[PDB]
Swiss-Prot record:
Highest taxon in the source lineage: Eukaryota
Residues of the full protein shown: 241 to 269 of 273
Cystine crosslinks: none
Residues reported in the UniProt entry to bind Zn(2+) 5: C14, C17, H30, C34
Official protein name in the record: Zinc finger protein 32
Subcellular location as annotated: Nucleus
Protein task: May be involved in transcriptional regulation.
Native organism: Homo sapiens
Zn finger intervals (CCHC-type): 12-34
Family affiliation: Belongs to the krueppel C2H2-type zinc-finger protein family.
Length: 42
């Protein structure tokens, strides 16, 4: 139920460390290693 979305090519920011990125894929690939979480189980 989205409505009134103002997105695009605006600056990016990681929700784990707070690093800035210029490329979209960069933020995604970063989230992979950027976990900061130990061995978790089901
Ligand atoms: Zn990060």
């Amino acid at each position: 139920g989205s409505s009134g979305s103002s997105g695009g090519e605006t600056p990016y920011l990681c929700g784990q460390c707070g690093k800035s990125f210029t490329q979209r894929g960069s933020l995604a690939v970063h989230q992979r290693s950027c976990s900061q979480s130990g061995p978790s189980s089901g």
